[PDB]
Design a protein around this ligand. Structure first.
Ligand SMILES: Nc1ncnc2c1ncn2[C@H]1C[C@H](O)[C@@H](COP(=O)(O)OP(=O)(O)OP(=O)(O)O)O1
Ligand SMILES: Nc1ncnc2c1ncn2[C@H]1C[C@H](O)[C@@H](COP(=O)(O)OP(=O)(O)OP(=O)(O)O)O1
Ligand SMILES: Nc1ncnc2c1ncn2[C@H]1C[C@H](O)[C@@H](COP(=O)(O)OP(=O)(O)OP(=O)(O)O)O1
Ligand SMILES: [Mg+2]
Ligand SMILES: [Mg+2]
Ligand SMILES: [Mg+2]
Ligand SMILES: [Mg+2]
Lengths: 493, 481, 481, 493
C-alpha cells in the first residue's frame, strides 16, 4: 500500500536465522524451500565429526548447520566479488545457484560422515566406487524431483535444466570427459572455485568448518576468512576469469593449510576418535545382513545398499547406531555387543604410531597385509602371550595439503597493489625458508584388540620390532614401551 | 588414573577415576542422545548440544566451587570424599531427563499419564540407583574413601531435595549445609547447574552470556546462618545476583520459550501421544513398556531417548501413520500458526486447572467481524507460560545471605530497596500464546479476530500487533485506548 | 584509494578515502591520547582503550546501518553522499572530548569554570570546524560528491542536535529524518555510538556484552511517523530494546560508576585544579591558555590530552608540587576511603544546586557514639550519581516506533504493560557515595558513624553494611528494622 | 572472632583484579606492594607493541597489564607443578619469588618497548650494550630500595638477600660466569624455566603475550597454554629437575613456535609498523640533545642517557613522543616535524622485500652499508629522478624459532604415559615431514624517504636491480613493479 515513482512497493521479507558462527543470516525463499524438505533436514541427524563426539564432547554438531554456513559463505563471496567488479556480470541467478550448491554439497553424507564413505562402504562393498559427493548429486536430484522445486526455481529467474546441471558440477566437478564444464562458460570460471575448489582447495567449505569445528571442539581457529574475502579479486588467468589473492596475503594462505593440517592432527585423526569410527564400522558390518530399510516401491535395502536408492538413503542416518544399540533381535547380538563395548569404554588399545622413512609410500593395495606383518615380527622379549594377525589393527592415514604431494600455493594466482588486474605467481622460495619441505606424509597407527595388560605389553614389542624391520621411524615412546627392542636399530641411535 | 577432557565451555577438565567409572555406563552415556533444548534445535541451528556435555560441566563446576570454598576455609573440613560426592551429584543430576528434555516431563507425561506425578529429578534418583546397581559402583566408591550407604543417600538428596517429610537431611549434617547449595540450590536457585547452562546454551544459541560465575566463586564465603554453615555472597555483589536472574529470564524469553520452539515441542508431543499405543520398549525381564510407561522401568527408560523421534519418522507400520504424519509436517515446515500473545492484567493468575478450558473460551468469543470461516475449540492451541525468578512470586535475593568487607564471618541480609529502584516490582508473570491448527489465510484471519476479542473479553493486555491484526476489535476496549 | 583496517571488535573494515583524509589529521589523531573510560583503567587493567578506535567503530557502524536501510528500501533514496556524511559524523562525534573523557566535562570544567556551559559535543562541533579549515577538507569533500556548506552543517547537527531554537533541522529534510537517528539519537538514545561502546568496553573490561546490534540492524525498517521517515524496530524485538538499556545500566553500575574509578577521577580532577594556574598550552597566534581555558581555542585544545597527567606527574616546578603530590598518592595507591552508599527514599530527588552542601550535612550529623576524632566538612566527599535510561524519568521505549510482520510499512507504539510486568517501575534514580579524605583507622570509623547517622536523619536507604559499620546507629531507625 | 581447634581464625582477604585475558586473579599482598610503586606503575605508559598501535588500532595495551598476566601465569604453573608433585618441595616462598620475577620481568622497557632497545639506543649510543632485561634488574633494585620492600618480603617468609638475587637471575639469566645459578640449587632448576626460559623459550611470558596481543590485534590465538600446564611434569634430566612435556604434545609445541612466527609476520614485523618505529626513533634522535629529564640529586639526563639513572628512567615513557609533538622550542622543530608527518600519514614509502638465497647471511656489521648498495645499482630503465644512499632505508629482520639456527624442540624433554618420571627426547623426523627444514631466516625490507610518484617508481627499479645483483630472492611483485629488470635474471625464470 505504498508507492514510489507511481509503482506499488512490494515488501518481500526474507527469513532470518541465527547461527553461532556467522550470526544472523538471511535466507532467500528459494533456499528456504530447498531446506524444508526431508532430504535436507536429514542432515540434522548426521554428526559432522562422526565418532569425534566420543572424544571431544563439544563436537555434537551436525551436517545441517554446517551446510547452512557453507551456503551463506558462498553467497557472501560471490556478492563481494560482484560488488567490487560489476564487469564480471554476476547475476542474482548466479548468486542463488552458488548458494544452493553450498547448501547441498553435503547431501550425500552417510552415518557419521567420513566414516561411512571412508571406512564402511569400502569394506562392505569393495566392488563399488562411492563418494559422498556422488551421493550429494543423486540426493540433490531426488530432492528436486520429490519436492517440485523446478517451478520455484523458474519463479526466481533460474533456468532449471542448465542451473541444476551447474549446481551438480559445483558439487562433484566435471560430469563428463578444453573447458570441461557446461553449466557456465570460461568467463565465469571463478564461480566453480567457490564451494568446492578442485584446483587448489581454497573454498568456503573449509572456511565454515574451520570456524564451526573449532567453536565446538574447544580449539581456536587462526585463519581469517573475512580478511581473505576483502582481498579477493577476479583476474584473467589462461583465458579464464579466476579468483586471485592479494600478493602479500600469501603467508596467510600457507597458514590456512597449516591450520587444516593441525585440525586433522589434533582432532579429526585423533587416535581414539579413529578407533571409535573403526568400532562403529565393525558393528555396522556385523549388522548389515539383518537391518532392513524400506526404499522406493517398498523394496528392501541394507545399510550397504541404501546408497543405491535415495528414498532408502534418506532414512539412513546416525539413528542406525541407536537402532543397533537398542535392538533385541539375537541376530544383532554381535553388532550390539560392539556398541556396548563403546559405551563401557572397553575400546581397542592404541599401541603406537610410526611413519615411513625414505621416499617410501605404503600403497593402499598393501593395507590389508599389514596386521599380518606385525604379528610375524619376532621380538627378542620374553612374553606371556602370543598374538595373531587378527589381534592387530593397522590404520594408515594420508596427511597432506589437499593435493597429494603438490603445493597448493603453486596453483594460486595473486595480484599486486600497483596492477590489480594482472595475475601473477609466487613460488615457495619467494615467501619463506621456514615453510614445509614436503606437502604429504603417512601416519601409521597400530592398535590391539586384546586389551589386558599382558597382551598390550606384548603388542608393543611386536609393533616396535615391526618398525625396526621395516626401517620405519622410531616411535616417540619407543625406548619406554620397548626398551629391549630399540637398541638393535642404530639408525635410531 | 585420572583423565583430561577438553570442553569448549570450560576448557581442559580433570576427571577423577571414580567419575570416569560412573560416566562410562549405558545409564550415563544415554545423555548423549537427548538434546538439552529439545525442539529448540529446530529454531536455533547451533543448539545441537546434548545433556551429556552439560552434565560433565555441572560435575566440573560443582567440584570447582567446593574446592575453592575448602581452600579458603580449611575450618569447614571439606574432604575429598565430600568433593567427589558433590561432583557425582553434579554429573548425575540430569539422569532422569527423557526425550527432548523439558518437553518430556513438561508436556508429554502430564498428557499421556495424568494420574502420575513425574519429574525428571525423581527420574534421576531412580536412574542413579539403577546405574549404581547395574555397574558395581559401590566397591569402586569404597576404594576411593566413600561410604556408599551414606553417600549414595547424600547424592540423592543433592539431586531431589529432602527424601522425607528441623534439619531435614541425613547425608550430611548442618555444619556442611553449604554442600547442599552447590548442585541444585532449593533455597534460592543459585547453583552450578545454571552457571553451566547459561554459558553452554549461549555458546550454542548465538546469544552472549553476561553472568560471570568465576567472579561469584571468588567472592563466595561460608558463614553461620541459624546453626548452619551456608554460602554467602559479598554484599556489593548483590547487583550481579539480580542480573543473574534477569539473564535467566532473558534466556527463557529469547530462546527457551520461543513461540516456534514451543509449537515444535507441542507437535512432537502430539506425535508421541499418537505413537504411544504402538511403540514397544523392552525393559527388565523382557517386559514391554510404552513411551509413557518406560518411566516405570529404568532398564526400558535407558533406551528411551530422542531416537524415538526418528523411529517414528522412519516407521512403515500403518498404525504409526498418524504420528509419522505429524513429524513429516515438521520436516516440511507446515507448523501450526502463531496468532498472538497476551498477558493477564490485575493480580489475576490463570490456574493450571483451567488451561484445558482456554481453547474453548477463544472459540466462544463473538467478534463483530464478517468471517468466511467458523473455528472450533480444537482448532486453537493456548500455551500458558509461567515466567518467574525461580520461586514463583518470591524474590530469590531475600533468601540470599551476604557478608561485608569489614566483618567477613558475619552473615547479613539485603532488601530490594537497599539496592535499586530500577529492579522488578514483581517476580512472576504469565504469558499466553495462542496458535491455530488451521493454516490457510482465511482461518488465520478469523483466528486473529477470535483471539483479540477473547483478550478484550478477559481484560487481558492488548496484543502488540492488535490494531493491525484486528482493527475492528481493538476500538471497543477503551482501557486499550 | 580505500583502506582496510583491522579492528578487534568489528574485524576488517573499509575506509573510503575521504574518511582517511579526515582521520589523518592532528585533530583526529589526538583521540589516540584520550582514554575512553578515563580513570577506569586504574581499576580495570584491560581498559587501556582510547577514543580513537571507538570513533573508527562508530563511523563504521553508522555506515553499516545506513547501507543496510538503503539496500532494503531503495525508495528512501539514500545516496553515497548521505552515507559518507553519516560516517563522518560517526567518526567525529567524539572530537570534543578532553583528558580522561567524561572526567573533563563531567567533573573538571564545572569546577574550574563554573560560569561557562561546556559539553564535549559542543567541543566536537568546534574541533570539527577547526579540522575542516586547517586541513583543506572542503575541496576533498567536493571531489566525492559532497556539498560542503550543507553537509558540514548536516554533520554538525548529527553531532550536537538542532543548531537553532516544526522540522528543526536544515542539513536534511523530513523524508531523511532517519539519518539523524543513527549517530546520536536525541529522541530515544538508540544509536550506533552505544553499540560500539557496549562491545568495545566489554572486550577491554573483561565483562561480556549481551546486546546484539547486528540482530537489531536486520530487523530495522524505515516507516512514516507523522510526516517523517523514521527508523522502526520489529514489534517482537521490544524485549531486546528494554535489555539494551538494562545492559547500559549494568555497565554503568559495574564499571563506569565503580566507586574506586570515580574517586580516582575525583583525585585526578583535584590535581588538574591545583595545576591549572601553572600549566601553559600555546594556542592560535602564540596565545597562552590554561587547562581550563584551552576549550576556548581549538589549536590549544588539540594539544590537551591525557598527557597532561604525566606532564604534572613528571614536573619539577615547585608551583606544581601540590598537584604532583596528589598524582603520586594515586601511584602509591593512597586513595580517599570509601565510606558507603545510600539512596533517597520517596519521590525525593537531590538537586544539583545542593550537591556542594552535602559534605557539610554529613559533618554536621550528631552520632551518639564515643569517637576519638572529630571530622569536618572538608574531610568528606559526597558523589551524587544519576542513573537512568537516558531520558531522565522517561521510558525511552515510549519514544520508539515498531512495525508488525503483517503490515511492515505501518508504524505502531507499544506500552510497558503490553510487554512484561518484570520491567522497571521507574527509569531514574540517584546513588549517593560518601568518601573520607582522612584514611587512618580512627577517622574511618568516625566517618562511618557520621555517614549512617546522616542517612538516618535524611530518611535515606539503610547502607548494606550499616549494621556492621555502625551497629550503634542503625537501631534508632525503625523504618530500617 | 571465630575459633577452630581452640585457635582464632585469621581472615586474610587477597585483592582480586579483573583482567580480560585471565579473568579474576588474586594478588598476594606482597605483590600488591610491589605493584603500587612509581617504578611499576610506569608500565601503564609504555605500549606493548610500540608503533604497532598506529597500524592495529586495537593494540592500545601497555606493558602494565601484560606484566600482571605474566606474574599470574608464573604462579599458576608453579602451583600446578607443586600440586601434582609434592616431592619437588615447592614452597609458597618459591611461588612468590616466581610471581615477582614474572611481574618485574618487563620493568626495564623504555618508550615503545622493543623500539627503544632494538632501534634507538643502538643508534644513539653505539658504545653501550643495553637490553631491557638488564634494565629490569636495575629498575627492580631501585623499586626494592626506594619503597622499603625488604621488610615486607621478610614478613612473608622471603629471605631478601637470596631471593632478590634469585628474582634477578630469573629475569636476566646467570649473573656471573657447572650450575651457574646461586638463588636456587639444581633440584629446583625447573623454577628458572618458568618466567624466561633461556634453554628453549617455552615460558609464561609467551603464553601471556600470545593471548593478550591476539585479543587486542584482532587475530586469533591457536596455542592452548592451559592444556600445556595440565600435561607438564618435572623429571630428572642430567642431574637437574626440569619441566617436561607429555610426549604426544610435541606437535602442539611445534605449533606454539609456528604461532610465534606468524605473530611476528602478521603483526610485530608489519612493514608499516616498523617504519613508524623507525620514524619515531629518528624523531628521538633529533630531540636527544634538547630534552632534559631530571634524575637522582637533580642531575640532568637525556633520552639516551636516562638508562644510566633509574630515577630519570622512571620518568621516561611513551610521554616523550607527546612532549616532542607538543613542544614549541625551535630546537625541537626537526624532531617535532617528523612526528607531525606521522600524524598526517606522510610516511616513508615501502618499496619491497627480499631474502638471501644460499646459506648466505647478512652480517649486522654490514647493515649500515646496504642503502649505499641500493643507490649504486644501475637499473636499465629511463627514470626522471636519481636517488642517493640517504633516500633509502634497508631494514634487516632476523626471523627464527628463538634460538637462531637451532630447533628449540631438540632442547625439550618429554615423558610417556607408561613411565611419567622418565625424561626422553624426540627428534624432528619422529614427528612429521611437514615441519620446517630450517629455523631461521632473514627478511630484507627496503623503503624510500622520497614519497612522490616519480621517486617511488625509481626506487622500485634500484631495489629490484639490487636484488638481481646480490642474487637475492625475486620480490613477490617484481614482475609488476620492475618488469624491465626481472627478465635479466634467469635464476628468477
Ligand atoms: N532475541 C533473540 N536474540 C537472538 N536470536 C534470536 C532471538 N529470538 C530468536 N532468535 C533466533 C532464532 C532464529 O534462529 C532466528 C529468528 O528467530 P525469530 O526472529 O524469532 O523468527 P520467527 O520466524 O520466530 O519470527 P517471525 O516469523 O515472527 O518473524 O533468531
Ligand atoms: N592437541 C589438542 N588440543 C586440544 N585438545 C585436544 C588435543 N588433543 C586431544 N584433545 C582433546 C580431546 C579430549 O577431549 C582431550 C583428551 O585428549 P588426549 O590428551 O588426546 O587424551 P587420550 O586419552 O587420547 O591420550 P592418553 O590416554 O594417551 O593420555 O583433549
Ligand atoms: N595477516 C594479517 N592478519 C590480520 N590482520 C592484518 C594482517 N596484516 C595486517 N593486518 C592488519 C593491520 C591493519 O589494521 C590492516 C591492514 O593491513 P595491511 O593489509 O597490511 O595494509 P597495508 O596498508 O600495510 O598494505 P597495502 O598498503 O600494501 O595494501 O590489517
Ligand atoms: Mg517465522
Ligand atoms: Mg586415554
Ligand atoms: Mg597501505
Ligand atoms: Mg579494594
Amino acid at each position: 500500500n505504498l508507492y514510489f515513482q507511481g509503482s506499488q512497493i512490494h515488501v518481500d521479507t526474507m527469513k532470518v536465522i541465527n547461527d553461532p558462527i556467522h550470526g544472523h543470516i538471511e535466507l532467500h525463499p528459494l533456499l528456504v524451500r530447498i531446506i524444508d524438505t526431508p532430504q535436507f533436514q536429514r542432515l540434522r541427524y548426521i554428526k559432522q565429526l562422526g565418532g569425534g563426539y566420543y572424544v571431544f564432547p563439544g563436537a555434537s554438531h551436525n551436517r545441517f548447520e554446517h551446510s547452512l554456513g557453507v551456503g551463506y559463505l558462498a553467497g557472501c563471496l560471490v556478492h563481494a566479488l560482484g560488488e567490487k567488479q560489476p564487469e564480471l556480470q554476476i547475476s542474482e541467478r548466479d548468486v542463488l545457484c552458488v548458494q544452493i550448491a553450498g547448501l547441498c554439497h553435503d547431501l550425500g553424507h552417510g552415518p557419521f560422515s567420513h566414516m561411512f564413505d571412508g571406512r564402511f562402504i569400502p569394506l562392505a562393498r569393495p566392488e563399488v566406487k562411492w563418494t559422498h559427493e556422488q551421493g550429494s548429486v543423486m540426493m540433490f536430484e531426488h530432492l528436486i524431483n520429490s519436492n517440485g522445486i523446478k517451478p520455484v526455481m523458474e519463479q526466481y529467474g533460474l533456468i532449471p535444466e542448465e542451473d541444476i546441471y551447474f549446481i551438480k558440477e559445483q558439487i562433484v566437478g566435471p560430469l563428463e570427459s578444453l573447458w570441461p564444464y557446461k553449466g557456465r562458460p570460461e568467463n565465469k570460471s571463478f564461480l566453480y572455485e567457490i564451494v568446492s575448489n578442485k584446483r587448489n582447495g581454497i573454498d568456503v567449505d573449509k572456511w565454515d568448518y574451520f570456524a564451526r569445528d573449532c567453536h565446538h571442539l574447544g580449539i581456536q581457529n587462526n585463519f581469517d576468512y573475512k580478511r581473505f574475502i576483502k582481498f579477493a579479486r577476479v583476474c584473467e588467468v589462461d583465458n579464464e576469469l579466476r579468483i586471485c589473492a592479494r600478493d602479500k596475503e600469501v603467508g596467510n594462505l600457507y597458514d590456512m593449510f597449516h591450520t587444516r593440517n593441525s585440525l586433522h592432527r589434533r582432532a579429526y585423526q585423533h587416535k581414539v576418535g579413529n578407533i571409535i569410527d573403526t568400532m562403529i564400522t565393525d558393528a555396522f558390518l556385523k549388522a548389515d545382513d539383518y537391518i532392513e530399510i524400506t526404499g522406493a516401491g517398498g523394496k528392501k535395502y541394507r545399510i550397504s545398499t541404501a546408497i543405491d536408492d535415495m528414498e532408502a538413503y534418506t532414512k539412513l542416518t546416525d539413528n542406525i547406531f541407536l537402532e543397533i544399540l537398542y535392538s533385541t533381535d539375537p541376530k544383532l547380538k554381535d553388532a550390539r555387543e560392539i556398541l556396548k563395548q563403546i559405551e563401557y569404554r572397553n575400546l581397542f588399545k592404541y599401541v603406537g604410531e610410526t611413519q615411513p622413512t625414505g621416499q617410501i609410500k605404503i600403497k593402499r593395495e598393501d593395507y590389508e597385509s599389514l596386521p599380518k606383518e606385525v604379528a610375524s615380527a619376532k621380538p627378542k622379549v620374553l612374553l606371556d602371550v602370543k598374538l595373531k594377525a587378527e589381534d592387530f589393527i593397522v590404520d594408515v592415514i594420508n596427511m597432506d595439503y589437499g593435493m597429494q604431494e603438490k603445493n597448493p600455493i603453486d596453483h594460486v594466482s595473486f595480484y599486486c597493489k600497483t596492477a590489480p588486474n594482472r595475475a601473477i605467481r609466487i613460488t615457495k622460495n619467494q615467501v619463506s625458508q621456514l615453510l614445509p619441505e614436503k606437502f604429504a606424509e603417512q601416519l601409521i597407527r597400530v592398535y590391539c584388540k586384546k586389551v589386558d595388560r599382558k597382551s598390550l605389553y606384548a603388542a608393543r614389542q611386536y609393533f616396535v620390532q615391526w618398525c625396526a624391520d621395516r626401517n620405519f621411524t622410531k616411535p616417540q615412546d619407543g625406548d619406554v614401551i620397548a626398551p629391549l627392542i630399540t637398541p638393535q636399530k642404530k639408525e635410531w641411535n
